[PDB]
Structures are given as structure tokens and as C-alpha cells.
Design a protein around this ligand. Structure first.
Ligand SMILES: NC[C@@H]1O[C@H](O[C@H]2[C@@H](O)[C@H](O[C@@H]3[C@@H](O)[C@H](N)C[C@H](N)[C@H]3O[C@H]3O[C@H](CO)[C@@H](O)[C@H](O)[C@H]3N)O[C@@H]2CO)[C@H](N)[C@@H](O)[C@@H]1O
Ligand SMILES: [Mg+2]
Ligand SMILES: [Mg+2]
Ligand SMILES: [Mg+2]
Lengths: 118, 220, 62, 254
RNA sequence: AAUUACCGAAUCUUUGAACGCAAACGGCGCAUGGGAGAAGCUCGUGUCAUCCCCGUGCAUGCCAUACUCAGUGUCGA
RNA sequence: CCGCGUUGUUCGGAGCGGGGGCUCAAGAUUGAAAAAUGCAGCUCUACGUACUGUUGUGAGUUCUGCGCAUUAACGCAAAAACCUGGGGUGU
RNA sequence: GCUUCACUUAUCGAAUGAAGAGACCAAUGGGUUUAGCGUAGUCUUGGCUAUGCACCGUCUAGGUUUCCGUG
RNA sequence: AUGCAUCCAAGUGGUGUAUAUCGCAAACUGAUUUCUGCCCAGUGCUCUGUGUCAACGUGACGAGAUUCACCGACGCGC
RNA sequence: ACACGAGUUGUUCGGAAACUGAGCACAACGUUAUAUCGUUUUGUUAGGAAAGUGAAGGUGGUCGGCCAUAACUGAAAAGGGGCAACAGAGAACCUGGGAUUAUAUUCCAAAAAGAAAUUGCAUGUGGG
């Protein structure tokens, strides 16, 4: 090359090829339909939980502790045909994550909680 | 309104154009020490055995030589895979220059080569450092040409340290013998000069100009 | 960041950087220091041309 | 049996400089082409105090020689340096206070400061507050300038090494008594850990060669050799002469 | 379709030489692929902006290798 | 060119003081919020209802005035992020 | 062996973002791939050398200043 | 500063040193006032450089190893 | 205390994402029989080619000679990464509640008791 106008030699940019995409490294099936049964585990049936179904609108579940609030809402749509407007998660001193899940006021909380059965 | 606005490039004036800082820049370490390796071989006093590789056969005798090494180059892989698959049918090497540091050496110990062509810049220089004195002890005409890329181009390689010419065809036989007289003028008949000519001891251009102006002021 | 540019600047040169007493002290020295060199540059070319006929007029005197 | 305090300060752990409130290193601007042939002009914008000097600093503003920018340059100031001054810097610079020009161009008998002992190292001699060098002579055969350092010890330096003109600023400082150990607390606050200073005779024999005994005495003579090991070389190191100097004033140094 | 023992087929969370970058952070990337998607657009379906999940590639050194370069290294037109 | 001003160590032809102004900072005031709220009462046939009420030239307050801002041989961190200009584009 | 004067290429140190070093002002300089033309002596494997010298060529330009100047 | 003191197993290592004699490093005494006398033989330091002091180097005898001779710096002597 | 059953709710609060400080020491380089050693902020690594970003223009689908969206050429940016502050920097939410046995500037759903502030992306209306 030529026309060196700076006091030091910085590296010229050669042509640089992209990396190949590998075919696979995992040989295991992963069903996208069962994938929200691990998000939502089971509902609580305690006294503070029963009060919030009736008085506010909310449902309460133990969920897995490594889910965010966005993927809990999407599992409360595919399992249960309801619309979550607000999830308030809580990692308990037991070690489990508990979510308070408020429904969209087009969906009754007791009508969902009878279909689940609690 | 196409008027001219000249920029003043005095000291302290308008900020200048981008210069060529190529001669004052920090280069990479391999290029700043392959350039100081070339100075250091020039500034130091070189023994007459490495001086002789800086003394090279000229262009008219080199361009005559490698064009004769070109036409007697070894046959390639296809030209050697054929003539053998066309001779396994006969039960069902035409002529070339001697190339290689083990083969050219044998062509002088046997005194079979009629001319040897030595390169000047093999990277461990001890490979062909002994090579002109073997041709001198056995009285084969030799050459040191400006090559090792141009010898390998003539014979189909990337690099050749030495090429020997054992024999040619009689068409270019006067051409082979005119080249031997052209090359003994430079190397073999001039052997007593080559053995005792200590080279090196050149100065800078910058140090040399400090002998002009250091003597032109003490000129009286 | 949410405010208009006018609560942070003013309608003239260097507005929001320099004040009125020193925007003008730069306008005044951008005129007087440029024009002082023009007085000294044109004095310099007038001196060298007067040299060009102080000695070239001595070609007709010896 | 234990390591002497003077040996321990060379580990430099608790004893390094207190540099967090210091400004940058004070030096002259780079000896570039623009000073080897012409002058660079700057302008003094601020006169500054940093902790741990008694001399005033100065930020001078040059234009960068090669780029569209301006270079902030922290120099140590001479006396009379005011903000706005237009320092000149280089070969063709005039002979005025504050200017920096080579020692070949400064006529003899001239008070200079920030003089540099080799060309280009940006100022190493006469930088403490109130100090200055005096130019004695020039030699044009050798191209060297011989000047008087602030100790009186003469020193021949190359005449292309540049120097600033003036006394170093902040002079007159040592002439006021401190009066308090409080005022010596804050003097050494921005410097380094070296105060209060405990005497060697007040120590135990494990800590210092002078320590111990039933009376606070140095036992052996307190003038030690040049060749003493670290730990043994305490006291008056290689003293040519001791006692109250009665007479003239010999310059100190080799 | 007992149960037990054995073993070929698999599963094998978070880590750790720990290796995308970090770290008293269940944290954050750059390419790439898949997903879900109640806003839009579409003639309720499709499609789907951010947001949000999931897989893979990417530490550094070296060996082999098949393309882009640097060099007032030696040549050469 | 004695004058203005502070409790106070001072200021002015390098522009004091008056007369008109432009700004900045700290508040005050009217309003939207906001009465629908809050509290204490109380009145009527069940965590029920209907109504009734919503100063200070005092003392203490570091928010602020406030800094090229302290005793000083003490001179009082940095950076991200942001803001305005210069120059250019829009031409 | 020893040494005091000039060297610079090892080595050392400093500075710099390795930012303008030297020439051109010219040899006690180079060059068979820059050795072109000679000239003496001398050797040779007739291709040509070595020594000693002259010339040519590389070798160009320039702020300012009445040849100097030195970017 | 081609420095002083000093870290340090080691390096193109480290601290006083972001420094530069109004500075850095090592000691002693202990505010001011008033003074600080005599002693350089001893012992330390320190300065200007021919007795003696090692390796190397040099030469000689011998077949050689071994010897012998000469040169030999700090330092003590002076 | 013991047994049993519960209990910690956030776009804005504290931290991180995302700052720098005293300092640390990964890469690079050197050393060491040995890396488990040194250097590594005085503007700043490494004898030291560590910028993968891209001004302006050329090439050819889009919006009224300006834009904007996709792929070649190349001005200009010296000085590699990452940590270290729940008291420094930075930081968009405030009340009322009959909302708890225990949490709330975190819960309150159509008269959100309510009143806001802010970020990302998108339609429509309007303006150039
Ligand atoms: N010691 C003999 C030689 O001295 C040389 O170095 C010498 C000088 O280069 C060097 O002085 C330089 C100074 O010139 C330049 N301004 C910068 C540098 N900081 C100085 O170094 C200084 O700083 C440090 C303290 O942190 C000290 O250790 C050092 O002794 C001191 N001289 O100090 C040394 C003086 O003896 C080389 N290190 C080396 O060739 C060799 O050591
Ligand atoms: Mg990891
Ligand atoms: Mg106050
Ligand atoms: Mg218990």
C-alpha cells in the first residue's frame, strides 16, 4: 500500500470470510406445545390466595423460578384461555417463585379457578 | 466567483495537508528489522566468502542463462506420469538440467556438470557458501546469479539453490559454450581476486555527507 | 434535555457559551488584529518595491 | 535484627507519593519541527496550584501543529507570568520572560529556568520554587553551553537544549517559620508519608543501628562509609567533613 | 407392567480445566437460526414492530489447511 | 471625587448614584388536581346512613443566598451521560 | 601488548502518537542490475581483470538577501 | 539523573520520583533569649595518589605435569 | 421454645443493565529449574502490524435537486479487554385507602381511590 499519513502502522483490513453455520449439536426432541407446562406448576390454595381470587381478580401459582413475567403471561394464555394484565412475581423463602396473576376483567377469576379446580 | 483561497503552510499558519509519514513512522517489528539487517550487512566488513555473493553475473549473461535453463527444465508431473504409463504399455527422461542441492553436488564430485548456476540469497547461506570453491577445486565453470526466485521459475519450482548443466542438445551447443566464456570472465578465471576481496565498510549517505562538509570547511 | 433551546441559549453568536461583554471583545479583535497585520503586510511590500527602484535606478548613475 | 525504616521506604507501599489531587507532570512542550525551525506561540489561560509544590503552574494553549485542535500544556510558571501572556516557544522566539528558546540563542549572563539537561526531555533542571540557572558561556567548537546550577555546581549542557526565562514562581517560601506541628502536617499532606521523624537513638537496637543503651547515644562514630550495606548505611553517609561549617560555603556534590 | 440383578440404548439441571464477556450479578453481548406475539397491516385469517423466550457459533495458544494482505526483504516489467 | 451600601473586613471613569429597562435565582399569589379525599363530631330507623365544622418585626430550622468560596508552605476528585456554540450541510 | 584523536554499525540512554533526518551548497563518494569513456603499469582459464589515476553519470530544484543563505 | 538513598530471586523490574538543590535522601539536637570553649594523637569517615595484595597476562627450565621469574587494582602502609 | 399452617407482590424504590476513584491484574511482553512472578492511569497495555467503525462519492429499488432503505470502493478516529462505590456520580411516582393475622411510595381495575412522569415501537390526524 501507500499514502501513510499517520505516525504508526495500523493493521490493514483484509477480506474476512463469515463462519459456517453448523448443522446440529443437539439430538433431543423439544416439543413447543409442552413447553409451558414447565413454566406454570400448580396453584396455591392458601387463605391470602383465596381472598385475592374473590376480591381483586388475581390468580396465584407456583411457577418455575427461572421464568420472567413476560413468559408467565404467555403460558397463562396457552394453558388457560385467559388474559393476564399484571404479574407480580416473588421468589419465596421456601425457594420457589410465586406469581400473582391478575386477569383482564373480561375473564372471571372463579370461572377459571373452577375449571382448574381448587 | 470562482476565486482562489491559498493556504499558508508556514510554521504556526494554516493546519497543513496530510504528509507522507512513511519514512518517519513506527513500522512493524519485522519490517523495521529486515531493513536494519540490510544496513548491518553493508556497514560491517564482510569476509571474502560472503562478499562473492554480492558480486553477481550481469544481465545479458543471466538472461541468456535462465532461458537455457528454461528449455532444459525437468518434465512436470503430468509429463512424468505419461512416458511411464506410455511405457507400461511397452511391456503390456529426455534431457534436463540437474536441480537440487544433493544432485548438483554429485555432478561436480563426478565432474559431470559443464556449468553450475548458483543463487545468491539462500536464507541459511552456509548451504551454498562452499559451493563456488567446489567448482573451483574441480574446474567446472560456475555462476552466481541474482536469483533463487528466478531459478525456480526457470525450472518449475518456487526456489532453487543450484542448477547444473551436464549436457545439452547440439543445436544450442555454441550458445552453451558462448555462455561459459561469458561466465569464466566474471568468476572462474578471476578467482585470485575473488579469494581476497574483503567487502563491506560502506557508510551512510548521511555519514558520507559529513565528510564533504567536514573537509570543505577545513580546506585551508 | 427536555427543554427548548431558548432556555439554554440566546439569539446571537456564541450564545449560551459567551456573554455580551466578550462576544464583542472578539468581534473587535477579529477586526483590529486582522487589520493591523494588513497595515504591516502592505508596509512590507511597499518597502521591498522601494528597494526595487533605489538600486535599479542606480543602473543610470555611475 | 529487623529492617531499618530507610530500607523500608524503597518497597514504596505506605510511602509512595500522595498524588490524587496532583495535576499532570509539569514539562515543556514537545520539541517538534515547529520549534527546531520557528516559534510556536501559546497563551497563558490559568495559573494553578497543585498539592505538594510551592511553585505555581500554568496551562498554556498552543495550536496543534498538524491537526485542527488546541493543546493544553501544563508548564511551571515563572514570576510575572500573567493570564493572557502569549508565551513564545522555539528557535526564532525573542528574548523575554516566559519564552522558551534554546540555550545557544540566549546571550550570556542570563537568568533561565526549566533548563533541560539533554535536548528534548522537556525540563529537568531549576524547577523548585524560586530557583534559576545563570548562563556563563558558550562554546561553538563543541556546541555546548556551560551554566551555573542553583547549587552553584557548574554543568555543561548542549546548546540545543532549551530553557524558559525567569525565576521559578512561588519564591520566598522557606523564609517563613512554620511555628506548628500542625502546619507541618499539612505541608507533608500532599507529598508522601515521611513525617513525624523519629530519631535513631530513640529506637531499640532491633530497629536501627543507633538505637538502644541506657543513655541515648550513638555508640560507634556516626559517619558511615560509602560502601556500607543497606541497613548499615545510616547516619552521615560518606561525610567528607563534619561539624559546624566555620568559614566559606563549599558546593555540595561530586 | 411384578421385583431384583446386570448392561449395550438414552436422559444427564447450575457450575467447575470452565473456554463469548462478567460475577457476593442466577447478569450482559456480537453473529446466526427457531419460537411465541391481544399493537399495526392484511382480504376473523394471515403477517407481525419493539418487548420476551430457545438453540448454535465465538476464550487463548498451537498444528495442519484454503482465500485476503503488509513489507524503502530480494528480485523482476 | 465625593457618593452608594452591609451586622461585617468595600466599591466606583476598567462607569458610582439616580431614570427607565433586560434577565437569573429563591419564593409568594390565582387556578387544574382537590373534594369526590382526610379527621373529629353528631343524627337517624348494619365494618348502616343523613348532615356539621374545616394571626405573628415570636423562637428553632443549611433548603437557599454561596462564589476564582475557609485557616493555608491545607487551595479542596474523577468520569459516564447531557447541554450550548463554532464550523459545515440544508444551498 | 598499550594508547588519544576522528568513526558508527553493536550497545546504552532520552524524547516522540517513532510528524518533516540528511543531501541538493557536493567528495579523501558510489555504480558490471548506475562501471559510460579513457589512460599508465600488471596478470589471465582468451571471455577479461587487478592496481593506479583523469572525465562522465547518479546530481535535481529553492523562502529571503545583495555571490550569501540553508529550508 | 551517566545521580543519591533504597526494593529486589529474576527482566527493557520497583520506591522516594506526577520529582529536579526554596528539591529528594540520611543523621543529630529540641520553642524563643543568651551562648556553644579547647582537643585531628585513638577510633571512624573522607581526599591526593608506590611498599605490599589475587586472578589474568608474559617469559623461561624441563619429555611434560609440576616449578621459577616478571607484570598485577581497589585496600591497608605513606 | 416446641409442633402445624401461612407470610416478602415494583416501568419509577435499592442494585444490575450503564459511571468513574483509591486500587486490582486478564491479554500481550519479559522473567523463573518452577508462574502460583513481574510490568499493567504521570493519558493509559504490548518491539507495538489489538480500530471490522465508517465522511464523501460511485453502483440501482423509494420519498418531493433533498431524504431514507440495500451492496462495492476509502477520508478520518494513536494508546487491548474487564473489574472495583446497596453512603461518591447517576436515578422517570406521588398521595388516599375499610388493602393484611403478617407485605406495601410494591397490593387497589372502569368512576382502576386515583393524579402523573418516563422509555421503546407503532398507527391515524396535521405540518414541511
Ligand atoms: N544505573 C546505571 C544505568 O542508569 C540508567 O538510568 C539512569 C537514568 O536514565 C535514570 O534517570 C531517569 C531520568 O533521567 C528521567 N527523567 C526519568 C526517570 N524517571 C529517571 O529515573 C529515576 O526514577 C526512579 C524513581 O522512581 C529511580 O529509581 C531512578 O533511580 C531515577 N534515576 O536513572 C538512572 C541514573 O542512574 C539505566 N537505568 C541503566 O542504563 C542503568 O541502570
Ligand atoms: Mg464463564
Ligand atoms: Mg454558610
Ligand atoms: Mg421453632
Amino acid at each position: 500500500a501507500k499514502s501513510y499519513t499517520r505516525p504508526q502502522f495500523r493493521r490493514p483490513h483484509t477480506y474476512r470470510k463469515p463462519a459456517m453455520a453448523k448443522p446440529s449439536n443437539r439430538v433431543t426432541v423439544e416439543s413447543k406445545d409442552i413447553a409451558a407446562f414447565s413454566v406454570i406448576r400448580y396453584p396455591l390454595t392458601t387463605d391470602k390466595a383465596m381472598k385475592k381470587i374473590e376480591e381483586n381478580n388475581t390468580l396465584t401459582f407456583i411457577v418455575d423460578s427461572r421464568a420472567n413475567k413476560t413468559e408467565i403471561k404467555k403460558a397463562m394464555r396457552k394453558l388457560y384461555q385467559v388474559k393476564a394484565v399484571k404479574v407480580n412475581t416473588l421468589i419465596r423463602p421456601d425457594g420457589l417463585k410465586k406469581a400473582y396473576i391478575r386477569l383482564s376483567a373480561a375473564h372471571d377469576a372463579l370461572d377459571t379457578a373452577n375449571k382448574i379446580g381448587l | 466567483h470562482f476565486a482562489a483561497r491559498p493556504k499558508n503552510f508556514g510554521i504556526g499558519q494554516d493546519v497543513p495537508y496530510a504528509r507522507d509519514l512513511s519514512r518517519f513512522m513506527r513500522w512493524p517489528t519485522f519490517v523495521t528489522m529486515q531493513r536494519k539487517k540490510r544496513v548491518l550487512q553493508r556497514r560491517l566488513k564482510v569476509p571474502p566468502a560472503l562478499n562473492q555473493f554480492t558480486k553477481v553475473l550481469d544481465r545479458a549473461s543471466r538472461n541468456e542463462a535462465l532461458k537455457l535453463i528454461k528449455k532444459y527444465a525437468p518434465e512436470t508431473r503430468k509429463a512424468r506420469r505419461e512416458r511411464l504409463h506410455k511405457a507400461a504399455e511397452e511391456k503390456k527422461a529426455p534431457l534436463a538440467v540437474v536441480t537440487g542441492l544433493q544432485e548438483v553436488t554429485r555432478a561436480i564430485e563426478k565432474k559431470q556438470a559443464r556449468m553450475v548456476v548458483i543463487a545468491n540469497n539462500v536464507d541459511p547461506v552456509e548451504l551454498v557458501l562452499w559451493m563456488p570453491n567446489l567448482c573451483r577445486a574441480n574446474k567446472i565453470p560456475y555462476a552466481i546469479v541474482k536469483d533463487m526466485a528466478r531459478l525456480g521459475d526457470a525450472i518449475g519450482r518456487k526456489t532453487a539453490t543450484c542448477v547444473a548443466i551436464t549436457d545439452v542438445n547440439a543445436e544450442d551447443e555454441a550458445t552453451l559454450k558462448n555462455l561459459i566464456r561469458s561466465v569464466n570472465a566474471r568468476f572462474l578465471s578471476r578467482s585470485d581476486v575473488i579469494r581476497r576481496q574483503w567487502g563491506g565498510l560502506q557508510l551512510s549517505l548521511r555519514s558520507r555527507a559529513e565528510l564533504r562538509k567536514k573537509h570543505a570547511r577545513n580546506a585551508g | 434535555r427536555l427543554a427548548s433551546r431558548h432556555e439554554k441559549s440566546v439569539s446571537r453568536a456564541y450564545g449560551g457559551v459567551l456573554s455580551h461583554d466578550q462576544v464583542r471583545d472578539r468581534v473587535v479583535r477579529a477586526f483590529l488584529v486582522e487589520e493591523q497585520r494588513i497595515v504591516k503586510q502592505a508596509l512590507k511590500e511597499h518597502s521591498k518595491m522601494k528597494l526595487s527602484h533605489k538600486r535599479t535606478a542606480n543602473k543610470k548613475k555611475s | 535484627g529487623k529492617t531499618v525504616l530507610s530500607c523500608r521506604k524503597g518497597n514504596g507501599s505506605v510511602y509512595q507519593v500522595h498524588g490524587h489531587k496532583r495535576l499532570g507532570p509539569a514539562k515543556l512542550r514537545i520539541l517538534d519541527y515547529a520549534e527546531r525551525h520557528g516559534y510556536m506561540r501559546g497563551v497563558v489561560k490559568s495559573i494553578e496550584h497543585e498539592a505538594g509544590r510551592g511553585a505555581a503552574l500554568a496551562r498554556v494553549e498552543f495550536r496543534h501543529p498538524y491537526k485542527f485542535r488546541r493543546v493544553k500544556e501544563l508548564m511551571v510558571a515563572p514570576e510575572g507570568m500573567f493570564t493572557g501572556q502569549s508565551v513564545f516557544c522555539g528557535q526564532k522566539a525573542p528574548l523575554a520572560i516566559g519564552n522558551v528558546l534554546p540555550l545557544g540563542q540566549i546571550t550570556e549572563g542570563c537568568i533561565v529556568c526549566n533548563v533541560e539537561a539533554k535536548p528534548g526531555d522537556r525540563g529537568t533542571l531549576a524547577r523548585a520554587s524560586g530557583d534559576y540557572c545563570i548562563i556563563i558561556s558558550h562554546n561553538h567548537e563543541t556546541g555546548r553551553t556551560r551554566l551555573k546550577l542553583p547549587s552553584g555546581q557548574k554543568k555543561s549542557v548542549p546548546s540545543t537544549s532549551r530553557a524558559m526565562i525567569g525565576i521559578i514562581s512561588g519564591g520566598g517560601r522557606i523564609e517563613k517559620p512554620v511555628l506548628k506541628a500542625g502546619n507541618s502536617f499539612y505541608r507533608f499532606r500532599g507529598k508522601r508519608n515521611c513525617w513525624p521523624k523519629v530519631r535513631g537513638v530513640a529506637r531499640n537496637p532491633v530497629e536501627h543501628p543507633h538505637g538502644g543503651g541506657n543513655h541515648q547515644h550513638i555508640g560507634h562514630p556516626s559517619t558511615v562509609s560509602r560502601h556500607s550495606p543497606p541497613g548499615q548505611k545510616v547516619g552521615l553517609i560518606a561525610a567528607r567533613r563534619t561539624g559546624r561549617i566555620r568559614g566559606g560555603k563549599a558546593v555540595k556534590g561530586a
